[PDB]
Amino acid sequence: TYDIGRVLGNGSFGVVTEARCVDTGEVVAIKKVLQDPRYKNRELDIMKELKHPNVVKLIDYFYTENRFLNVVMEHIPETVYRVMKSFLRANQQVPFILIKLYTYQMCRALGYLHALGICHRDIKPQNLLVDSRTHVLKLCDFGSAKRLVPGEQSVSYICSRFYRAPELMLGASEYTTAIDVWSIGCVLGELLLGRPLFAGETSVDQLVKIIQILGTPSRRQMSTMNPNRFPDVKPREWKSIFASHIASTDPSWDQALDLLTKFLRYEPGERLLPLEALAHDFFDELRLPSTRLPSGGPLPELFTFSQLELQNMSPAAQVKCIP
Ligand SMILES: O=C1NC(=O)C(c2cnc3ccccn23)=C1c1cn2c3c(cc(F)cc13)CN(C(=O)N1CCCCC1)CC2
Ligand SMILES: [Mg+2]
Ligand SMILES: [Mg+2]
Ligand SMILES: [Mg+2]
């Protein structure tokens, strides 16, 4: 059924190879992982549930040989990571339309996941597939994802370090899908800046870099992150962090930095929820009928909200997001 070739090379468990479905001629990605004798594979189980324009499609799966599970998923040629490095090498800002398009599609995917009670727990530019020609974006790498409900205890040391919520580094074991929302803010920040917003050398240093920009959380704020004292540090205004990028650039910066602030709240419950975030005016340009990609092509799918998405959006956000 498959012609398997070329390992694509993930930085997590399993091997992912490019392959061709000989039934369809379509290039696919196949993730091979060790399958447990007794337990279901949680990644596959989650993949079987997800049907969303901004989540990699589950195409097939089969068992090989313990044994191996092979998860056949749709193939997308690039990642937000790779797009960003281009612009970094060209010493160029990512165009605001692309930042808007990627942030919107990442919020939709994660909104859907959270509607199913699923926490992705590894949101990062490497895990966000993109096809440059259409600027579609799809979430992938569900190897760390978990069906999470509040009151559940889980591993603390869980995201990739730059995108890791502050409650996780403060040893919270009962966290929420809000940790994915902090990662969204970090990706937005990285799109605006060109380089990771908070780039710690260790997980503790990650927290310190966060505190150095946002400032010291109050003791009240500390208990929203872990109910179980930091030095006082002058925080930095966002207009200070992004000053070089602002100089070299609509009220897009006011809108982006408002959105940035609401994703990156210390208090996990105060972070702006992904589907509500879609109604932010930062995305108004995506809802204009005349808007096209910088190359002139049409926008990708943006307004095809599923029943489950709409049932998790305030009525105010529903009327705003459907044009
Ligand atoms: O097409 C796909 N369908 C999937 O499900 C899927 C997939 C499954 N697991 C992961 C983990 C991370 C990223 C993507 N995936 C891919 C998939 C698509 N590329 C992949 C690359 C490596 C890889 F290992 C898997 C894939 C290379 N690449 C990329 O930009 N990189 C590689 C990782 C660090 C730098 C960013 C361009 C396309
Ligand atoms: Mg099981
Ligand atoms: Mg099969
Ligand atoms: Mg939501």
Numbering used by the authors: 27 to 91, 101 to 263, 268 to 288, 292 to 365
What text comes from the article?
Successful co-crystallization conditions were achieved by incubating purified TgGSK3 with LY2090314 prior to final size exclusion chromatography and concentration. From these two constructs, two crystal types were obtained (statistics are shown on Supplementary Table 1): an orthorhombic system diffracting to 2.1 Å with one copy of TgGSK3 per asymmetric unit, and a monoclinic system diffracting at 3.0 Å with a crystallographic tetramer of TgGSK3 per asymmetric unit. Although LY2090314 density was clearly visible in both derived structures and in all copies of TgGSK3 within the monoclinic system, structural representations are derived from the orthorhombic crystal structure. LY2090314 is therefore classified as a “type I” inhibitor, competing with ATP for binding in the ATP binding site. Similar to other maleimide-based kinase inhibitors, the maleimide group interacts with the hinge region of TgGSK3, forming hydrogen bonds with the backbone residues E128 and I130. In the vicinity of these direct ligand to protein bonds, LY2090314 also interacts indirectly with TgGSK3 by coordinating 3 water molecules within the cavity. One of these water molecules forms a tetragonal coordination with both LY2090314 and 3 side chains of TgGSK3, including the catalytic lysine K76. At the opposite side of LY2090314, the only direct hydrogen bond with an amino acid side chain involves the previously identified threonine 133, underscoring the importance of this residue in LY2090314 binding. Finally, the T133M mutation confers the most dramatic increase in KD (18-fold) and IC50 (5.3-fold). This is clearly explained structurally as the T to M side chain mutation will abolish one of the key H-bond interactions and at the same time introduce a significant steric clash to LY209314 binding.
